[PDB]
Design a protein around this ligand. Structure first.
Ligand SMILES: *C1O[C@H](CO[C@H]2O[C@@H](C)[C@@H](O)[C@@H](O)[C@@H]2O)[C@@H](O[C@@H]2O[C@H](CO)[C@@H](O[C@@H]3O[C@H](CO[C@H]4O[C@H](CO)[C@@H](O)[C@H](O)[C@@H]4O[C@@H]4O[C@H](CO)[C@@H](O)[C@H](O)[C@H]4NC(C)=O)[C@@H](O)[C@H](O[C@H]4O[C@H](CO)[C@@H](O)[C@H](O)[C@@H]4O[C@@H]4O[C@H](CO)[C@@H](O)[C@H](O)[C@H]4NC(C)=O)[C@@H]3O)[C@H](O)[C@H]2NC(C)=O)[C@H](O)[C@H]1NC(C)=O
Ligand SMILES: *[C@@H]1O[C@H](CO[C@H]2O[C@@H](C)[C@@H](O)[C@@H](O)[C@@H]2O)[C@@H](O[C@@H]2O[C@H](CO)[C@@H](O[C@@H]3O[C@H](CO[C@H]4O[C@H](CO)[C@@H](O)[C@H](O)[C@@H]4O[C@@H]4O[C@H](CO)[C@@H](O)[C@H](O)[C@H]4NC(C)=O)[C@@H](O)[C@H](O[C@H]4O[C@H](CO)[C@@H](O)[C@H](O)[C@@H]4O[C@@H]4O[C@H](CO)[C@@H](O)[C@H](O)[C@H]4NC(C)=O)[C@@H]3O)[C@H](O)[C@H]2NC(C)=O)[C@H](O)[C@H]1NC(C)=O
Lengths: 209, 209
């Protein structure tokens, strides 16, 4: 009936490098037409901070508006698991709605990255699958990417993290390339970005034998 | 605002074998403690059916009833894409609630199935990963299982299906085995069940080269 809040974490990549600007994000939907005024409050471990940046209002094709507030956060505060609260206010609610979010708790575990060449079966096609396996990792927050000769590779998909029997995580990422490119010996690389890696980064390479 | 409905599909495995019994399950929750009486109507392609089988009272701990109706479906009807609709009637609600479920539309596409041995770099550990790449398949309904010397294998996990770039789906399945088992030359088998496979079934195997 009333407005509903939704609280998102920052991207895996953004928390792992000073280069990047990680953010938590409070999205309110079903903001009433008659009362449009939404007030956001942000707290780190209960202690209020103030740098949230409320953004305009995106009117939705169902009568209601959508108000998004973005809190910037320090890399190490998220990595150290500090707790982030969004309190949202509006006259279409009797009480203010709150949401709290934080990194998954627990000893981080270093991912193990193994690359696997195409199956002999598959070498009968005009495209081949280069596979990257990332297992053993915790928390589930990770980024994976591909490249050749310094250049980002376009055509890959990566599975979501899957919970493994030992409570750690794994995924597979698939890069699709022209068989010729594989046949001609070009070197392809799997880039994995996780908290528990040295410099939050590792890169594993694969090429024709 | 009172009761809510959820409509779950049959299990992929269940629709592909006469041997199995696929069902569609309508679940109504949050039922007014005052008035306990929910009335189910079922429809197959608009046309009412009556072989539905409704159960009694699963009042979960909250002070509200849960009622489950199960419609037994014919294997061919599901694969032909027949629509199943659950109407839940109640004096609390003004209009009765409707939910519909079916097999995703599109032209079905045959999965290619490829087994990938453990990376050279993994073989230093005591447990190793046998990988099964299933790709090129539509719709996303599929099942994957492992076995060796005719016996279901214990320790695998399968990623959810992932929408690939050509609108087909792919997944990977990982079977973990002790290194020895792999080194003794044991054959291991990925088995995939999908509507677009011949006899709804293919098996692809894997051993030490
Ligand atoms: C009293 O409690 C009730 C439940 O018992 C609770 O007891 C307490 C003590 C505690 O133990 C709790 O943990 C217990 O849950 C409350 O009822 C619950 O209500 C919530 C929602 O408020 C229901 O949530 C839905 O759940 C489904 C998934 O349900 C499966 O898994 C559940 C466990 O994870 C299980 O409980 C269910 O039984 C069910 O199991 C399946 O059962 C079928 C048939 O029996 C089997 O064939 C399956 O194998 C089996 N699955 C397996 C395995 O578990 C979830 O999918 C629903 O999500 C949809 O809806 C959301 C909105 O409601 C939406 O946000 C989601 O995106 C999603 O919507 C759909 O998403 C896809 C996208 O592709 C599309 O299908 C649609 O586009 C989209 N549809 C839309 C728009 O809706 C949903 O979250 C919960 O299941 C239910 N519990 C039971 C039991 O049924 C009750 O509210 C409470 N009372 C009060 C007053 O508070
Ligand atoms: C009027 O329009 C509104 C918006 O526009 C609509 O336009 C129409 C034309 C059509 O296009 C629609 O499809 C559009 O939605 C509607 O608003 C919607 O309201 C619903 C709630 O009813 C929202 O549903 C929730 O979605 C979140 C996930 O949101 C992300 O993913 C969406 C795609 O799947 C995406 O569209 C969203 O924008 C959002 O994207 C993310 O954004 C962040 C921040 O910017 C980015 O940084 C991310 O990268 C980006 N993600 C990417 C990438 O996809 C989902 O999480 C919610 O599920 C939770 O809550 C359910 C009930 O509230 C519950 O049933 C679920 O089980 C689930 O509950 C949580 O489960 C997690 C699991 O781990 C736990 O962590 C929690 O414990 C648990 N939480 C609790 C307490 O329940 C939910 O599905 C929808 O997002 C929103 N649309 C957008 C967009 O904002 C409005 O409904 C519509 N009215 C109608 C009906 O006409």
């Amino acid at each position: 009936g009333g407005p509903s809040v939704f609280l998102f974490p920052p991207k895996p990549k953004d928390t792992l490098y000073i280069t990047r600007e990680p953010e938590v994000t409070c999205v309110v939907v079903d903001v009433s037409h008659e009362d449009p005024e939404v007030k956001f409050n942000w707290y780190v471990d209960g202690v209020e901070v103030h740098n949230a940046k409320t953004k305009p209002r995106e009117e939705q094709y169902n009568s209601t508006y959508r108000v998004v507030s973005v809190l910037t956060v320090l890399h190490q505060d998220w990595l150290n698991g500090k707790e982030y609260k969004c309190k949202v206010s509006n006259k279409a609610l009797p009480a203010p709605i709150e949401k709290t979010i934080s990194k998954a708790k627990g000893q981080p575990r270093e991912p193990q990255v193994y690359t696997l060449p195409p199956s002999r079966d598959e070498l009968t096609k005009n495209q081949v699958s280069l596979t990257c396996l990332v297992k053993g990792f915790y928390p589930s927050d990770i980024a994976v990417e591909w490249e050749s000769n310094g250049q980002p590779e376009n055509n890959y998909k990566t599975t979501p993290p899957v919970l493994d029997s030992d409570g750690s995580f794994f995924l597979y990422s698939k890069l699709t390339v022209d068989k010729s490119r594989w046949q001609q010996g070009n070197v392809f690389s799997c880039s994995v970005m996780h908290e528990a890696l040295h410099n939050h980064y590792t890169q594993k390479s694969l090429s024709l034998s």
